[PDB]
Design an enzyme around this catalytic site. Structure first.
Site, PDB file in Angstrom:
ATOM      1  CE1 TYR A   8      -3.812   2.499   1.296  1.00 66.99           C
ATOM      2  CE2 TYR A   8      -1.817   3.651   1.956  1.00 66.99           C
ATOM      3  CZ  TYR A   8      -3.175   3.655   1.718  1.00 66.99           C
ATOM      4  OH  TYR A   8      -3.902   4.803   1.936  1.00 66.99           O
ATOM      5  CG  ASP A  65      -5.445  10.748   6.300  1.00 66.99           C
ATOM      6  OD1 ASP A  65      -5.217  11.941   6.591  1.00 66.99           O
ATOM      7  OD2 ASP A  65      -4.660  10.054   5.611  1.00 66.99           O
ATOM      8  CG  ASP A 105      -1.822   5.036   7.205  1.00 73.93           C
ATOM      9  OD1 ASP A 105      -2.286   6.022   7.818  1.00 73.93           O
ATOM     10  OD2 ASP A 105      -1.638   5.022   5.971  1.00 73.93           O
ATOM     11  CG  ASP A 120       7.545  12.545  10.868  1.00 73.79           C
ATOM     12  OD1 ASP A 120       8.252  12.320   9.861  1.00 73.79           O
ATOM     13  OD2 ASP A 120       7.856  13.385  11.743  1.00 73.79           O
TER      14      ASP A 120
END
Lengths: 121, 121
Positions: free
Chosen positions: A15, A39, A98, A95
């Site tokens: 990913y 997100d 996930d 930075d």
């Protein structure tokens, strides 16, 4: 659950691999049709592949895995990575980490990105 | 929530200062009396400062932060760290990723760790 810890690491690594080469098409195929995504985490989530393909399409950015992927035994994982961009001609890094949960078909059923301005260098 | 982005960074990086030394009593003080801990993520949860006290002591050992804490704006955090040890006369690292939510008082109200054998070196 389904994906094994070793598989999660495989999936998650890729990913971040597609995000780099900028393959909007492939990423969206790892997601579930009814997957969700917060997100920056916290913020309201965009659900479903189209919305997930809109944000992904909407936002020269390079991605890098800064540390090993942490895979659990119930289909979850978390990886540390960093996105290099350009704040309008001003090369800035971000930075991020996930936290993804895969389904019994190996699809991201949900993803949450942790980051804010304190992670922007 | 409550703790701002920067606040949360410190509290988290603070937590790892305590695990490295070994101060179990200070450790068990960040956690709220009602807190819960899923460790490793995927396991039944442990409720109560009490039980977390038993678990803490439960596990020579020095935890180092591997990179920035990713901090949100809803009192949550995520951080990558390694944990050196020597499992049965054989040194061995463990790369983990902890995610914790803090309540209004800045106490870790909830925590989840992401690891498994695939992260033992």
């Amino acid at each position: 659950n389904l994906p094994t810890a070793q598989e999660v690491q495989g999936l998650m690594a890729r990913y971040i691999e597609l995000v780099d080469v900028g393959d909007i098409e492939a990423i969206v195929q790892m997601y579930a049709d009814d997957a969700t995504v917060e997100d920056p985490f916290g913020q309201p989530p965009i659900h479903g592949r189209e919305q997930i393909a809109a944000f992904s399409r909407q936002g020269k950015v390079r991605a890098c895995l800064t540390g090993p992927v942490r895979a659990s035994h119930n289909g979850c994982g978390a990886m540390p990575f960093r996105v290099e961009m350009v704040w309008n001609g001003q090369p800035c890094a971000l930075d991020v980490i996930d936290v993804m949960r895969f389904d019994e078909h190996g699809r991201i059923q949900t993803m949450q990105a942790y980051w804010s301005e304190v992670n922007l260098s």
